[PDB]
Design a protein around this ligand. Structure first.
Ligand SMILES: Nc1ncnc2c1ncn2[C@@H]1O[C@H](COP(=O)(O)OP(=O)(O)NP(=O)(O)O)[C@@H](O)[C@H]1O
Ligand SMILES: Nc1ncnc2c1ncn2[C@@H]1O[C@H](COP(=O)(O)OP(=O)(O)NP(=O)(O)O)[C@@H](O)[C@H]1O
Ligand SMILES: [Mg+2]
Ligand SMILES: [Mg+2]
Ligand SMILES: [Mg+2]
Lengths: 591, 585, 153
């Protein structure tokens, strides 16, 4: 044996390789969704690579969700609870001097602290449960960027309260409990309110990243004869209907001549993606009041103060089933086991609360801006009335369902999709050149395929599929959908021993009626309306699909659709800036 | 109150934050291996990452002097190549099977160094400081100099691989997160050893900086330094460095290869530039020159006569056994000479000059360089280091002869002193030639314990002016008088007794041959004075007074190597903070 | 329109030249290159990085670069590179060495097979480390040595 030697010669090259090549390490990334309906964490894992003289960066295709957190209080609740105590009960109906509330900053902090402690703990619970001991070492070492972004739920919030809150939130994120050893941190670029358009663009980025349509390599890019990087497949647009807002985003087919008023976003120019990625001009617009909860409250207020539908105390609703009936208010509906519908009068759980609160005559946004007052009134909110009144549906005792889809559609059309005045709190959408959903496809349009997302939107299509009213291979044909919805929404509601039941026409079967599906027909109408406007556009999307997540290369999805992944990618993709903030500055900055 | 509470918090998240960092430079010099523990102020700013304030760099502890890397390696070779590999052909490919054991031996040394560092950190830092230091990680730069620069075969670079792996696996118990990489921890060339020392000097004396205090952008867009950058001379254990910037636009011979600070990546673009001559000479250090001087002097007939070697660089009345072995001056005034080969001051040179070192075996010119200094590569080690036909060395205390012997032996040798391919490739064979070829009005600072003791001693006895400015002939006078001294044994031990009833001082192991160094200084100043340009002035210094008053750090190459890395902010931020210690996982 | 970079490089013929004369000449050469006749309209220019004496090793390394560029052995794209599992860019084909015998000198240049343990005296050049090629190109440690007196003449 003179191979005791060959082992030495390797021993050295082994060690030489080690100090000359890149090393991979695992990092945690936390996106806290401070959406309208709730505040909740999303915990991501990612593979980082450090190379000699090159620093450290994240492999974007390695980003994967590993836990979606419990749904805690939205930031509105925190803020309005604060105001209740320190501005006095029923500030929604009185002039409140805002300079006075600066002396209660510490207490805002306190209340925020309560929420954040839950979020922190919940994140940590997900990390501890999902990661083996070896993975934990790498994650605790590298620090854990936290991106908390508020969306529609607090986008409309008045005075300076929302931005003050974010200051306090960031300070809270940056002082994590030392006991668990995960080193959370953030900065004012990661943790902030995101605009409607950003909410849209990030969702667009997520979709095209996960579906492997958008990337920088030769797999997903071609540099053309003329030096411009193109995407090999067409980037796909997205439609996301949330709790309080909906986003419509699509890339324009290249060289579309736009009206001067229509303000499209260029991905490179606007620093959404780095220069080395393909570019596109994309339309991204977000509509307040178009979300499930928002639209629900407004739809009732508007329908049931119109004569065609309100007649001597009874409001006939084309979007609710024959046989269904409920108390007349926008309050939260619980479908009880005995088939009755219970409506919660607690103002906070009333689905008009956001819009009613924005429309206060004592909110400077209305007080000084008549155009905003006009927008409120047109949707039957009178800013001069106190809150209770504002949310009250006048002269109405009960709401009875008439189950007429087409009327439902045309009511959704004139109320939500194509209103006379823009739905309130939509200065953003309007400044892009869009007042209503209607106008989006009249002004810009694209052959870009569109993916429709959101629980509601999906439940709408799934339900019709489940009952074999739609093709399994449903491609987006509007008239086919209108047919299925027409039949389905005709259903009669029948109380049985096993509770309330939706019974389909022509002995075609049934399903239980519950708190989530009772008004699902409205969303079917919304979908139909929206597909009709699309189909009327100068360009029409090559196809349309409904999806919740995208199958990963493995087969199983790496993450959910939404803006979460997008916001991560928006930051980590600028490798030099990210390396600086995430690793150089890092958590050690907090000292 | 609330309105402030908010702006307070707003300022916090919008401005830069200061944090303390530890930096460790381990000096793997010829005489020993030792830590130097530095503190520095880091600043992180939103979107700008993190960097070090260079003016905040300060030494906070110089460590204990442990075994040099030569010892580690030769101790390794003794065991695994067999005793007395210095005198036999040793097949180098065979020693690859003993890598693990080299590791083992290195581990012993590094554990001491780590522990010592930690001891310094714990003792110097309060609890609040400790938190910041443990959090940011601790870059370690271990750089070997002349002690191992001459080491043969592949052993030295293998060792460095193992050293880095050891630095990168620190004990978790103390919580300080040491790390390194192949740029920070490595052998440094002679010229680098020079340049860093040059950088240190001009940094600490606030001659070199980027701001308006120390720079002017001229009419033509070039950044100049406001004060003249100063050159340095450092005489270490085994080598000496000479470094000086050239007055701008000096036409050099094509063979003289000067270094440009920007061009050669020594300093970042935003600092003033200069072309600087930096050359390092093996055998010119205190210990190296000591052994070589004896071998050469005492095999010359003028000095060796029937067993007795008359040394002009040793005092009248002093005498010692005839070898290059380490000299202990005993309390009873005798001089004891250690025959242990390892403690013999010819060991490095004698080892390099093996006929079985490929550097000699295949390169006749290197053989010739050995032989010219009375090392015969074909003889076994003991013989090579032996001074032939010599029993005792007696001092004759004649300074001028000492000077002229230092001149021909060390400063202006026929052939270049061995192991100096580096110096030579720069265009310099000998110290002599440096000032013949390039020269500069740049003022010069002389550094090194030896060099300093030389001037201090003459000062202490009032033979030199307190305000000594570098006048050669004044120095030659003082040295002439001093080196004339007679050595007298008294009850209180051996005593150096000055002429003309001029006082006295104890003779000890450090000062017994100090006259040599006085001769070296005189020789060097003479060559300087003969240059086409002459340095505006010359001074001797150990450290530079900080802005406070007290010195921030020592002269040397330590600060320079830190500055060389941290000054490239983007690269440093990347390596020190982004990759950092977390890389080791 | 674009201007015409000029790189004038002296090799072995004047590498050995004594005193300061050769570098003085290069100053004057550059000033001459930078004052071209306006009549022909080609806008020649240079600077002290392009126009200079090149060392033997550079003379070697540039020749090595030429060879592997022209034979399409050396490049940065997926045609001529693979990024390995461990993040290091490799060349797909082996880089080839060169031997050039000129008038006054000969060059011998070759890349080392990766992880060759060299004697401490043997000083190999790393292409990235020594700024010969940019970071995005594959790296190699290459031996490049030039011998005066070995040329034909
Ligand atoms: N299967 C379903 N059927 C009907 N409604 C649903 C279903 N799933 C969720 N919803 C409703 O749709 C909303 C879910 O959207 P979500 O994106 O969680 O809101 P959000 O992000 O908090 N608001 P935003 O600020 O617009 O992002 C909730 O208000 C639910 O009541
Ligand atoms: N006051 C003094 N008087 C005389 N000799 C001294 C004095 N101080 C130190 N020395 C000697 O000078 C040397 C000190 O230089 P030092 O810089 O510690 O060596 P080193 O850095 O290990 N070698 P190098 O590789 O050249 O940097 C030692 O060999 C001492 O023996
Ligand atoms: Mg949302
Ligand atoms: Mg030293
Ligand atoms: Mg040629």
């Amino acid at each position: 044996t003179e191979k005791r030697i060959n082992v030495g010669k390797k021993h050295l090259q082994t060690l030489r390789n080690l100090e000359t090549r890149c090393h991979d390490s695992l990092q945690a990334l936390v996106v806290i969704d401070a959406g309208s309906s709730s505040t909740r964490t999303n915990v991501f894992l990612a593979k980082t690579r450090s190379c000699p003289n090159k620093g450290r960066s994240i492999d974007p295709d390695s980003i994967q969700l590993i836990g979606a957190g419990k749904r805690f209080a939205g930031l509105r609740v925190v803020l309005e609870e604060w105001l209740d105590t320190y501005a006095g009960k029923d500030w929604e109906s009185r002039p409140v001097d805002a300079r006075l509330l600066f002396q209660y900053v510490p207490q805002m902090h306190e209340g925020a602290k309560k929420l954040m402690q839950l979020l922190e703990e919940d994140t940590v619970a997900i990390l501890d449960s999902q990661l083996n001991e070896k993975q934990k070492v790498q994650v605790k070492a590298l620090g854990i960027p936290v991106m908390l972004c508020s969306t529609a739920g607090v986008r409309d919030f008045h005075e300076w309260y929302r931005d003050a809150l974010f200051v306090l939130l960031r300070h809270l994120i940056n002082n994590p409990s030392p006991a668990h050893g995960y080193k959370f941190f953030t900065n004012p670029f990661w943790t902030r309110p995101i605009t409607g358009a950003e909410e849209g663009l990030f969702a667009f980025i997520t979709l095209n990243h996960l579906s492997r349509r958008l990337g920088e390599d030769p797999a997903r890019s071609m540099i053309d004869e003329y030096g411009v990087k193109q995407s090999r497949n067409d980037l796909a647009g997205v439609v996301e209907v949330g709790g309080a807002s909906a986003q419509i985003v699509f890339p324009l087919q290249e060289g579309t001549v736009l009206p001067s008023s229509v303000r499209a976003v260029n991905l490179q120019r606007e620093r959404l993606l780095p220069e080395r990625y393909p570019s596109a001009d994309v339309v991204s617009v977000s509509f307040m009041q178009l979300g499930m909860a928002s639209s629900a409250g407004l739809f009732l207020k508007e329908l049931c103060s119109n004569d065609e539908f309100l007649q001597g105390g009874i409001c006939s609703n084309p979007c609710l089933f024959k046989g269904f009936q409920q108390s007349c208010s926008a309050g939260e509906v619980e479908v009880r086991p005995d088939g009755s519908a219970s409506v919660n009068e607690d103002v906070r759980k009333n689905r008009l609360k956001p819009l009613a609160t924005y429309c206060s005559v004592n909110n400077p946004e209305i007080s000084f801006k008549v155009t905003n007052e006009m927008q409120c009134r047109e949707n039957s909110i009178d800013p001069t009335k106190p809150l209770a009144e504002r949310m009250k549906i006048e002269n109405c005792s009960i709401i009875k369902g008439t189950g007429n889809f087409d009327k439902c559609v045309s009511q959704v059309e004139s109320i939500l999709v194509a209103p006379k005045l823009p739905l309130p709190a939509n200065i953003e959408a309007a400044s892009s050149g869009f007042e209503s959903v209607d106008q989006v496809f009249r002004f810009a349009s694209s052959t870009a395929p569109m993916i429709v997302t959101g629980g509601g939107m999906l439940a709408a299509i799934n339900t019709l599929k489940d009952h074999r009213l739609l093709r399994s291979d449903f491609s987006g044909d509007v008239e086919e959908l209108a047919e299925a919805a027409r039949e389905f929404c005709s259903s009669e509601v029948i109380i049985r021993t096993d509770g309330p039941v939706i019974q389909l026409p022509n002995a075609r079967g049934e399903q239980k009626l519950n708190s989530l599906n009772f008004d699902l027909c409205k969303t079917m109408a919304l979908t139909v309306s929206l597909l009709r406007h699309m189909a009327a556009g100068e360009n029409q999307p090559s196809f349309i699909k409904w999806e919740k997540s995208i199958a990963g290369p493995d087969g199983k999805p790496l993450a959910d659709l939404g803006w979460q992944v997008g916001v991560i990618l928006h930051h980590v993709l600028f490798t030099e800036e990210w390396g600086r903030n995430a690793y150089e500055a890092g958590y050690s900055h907090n000292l």
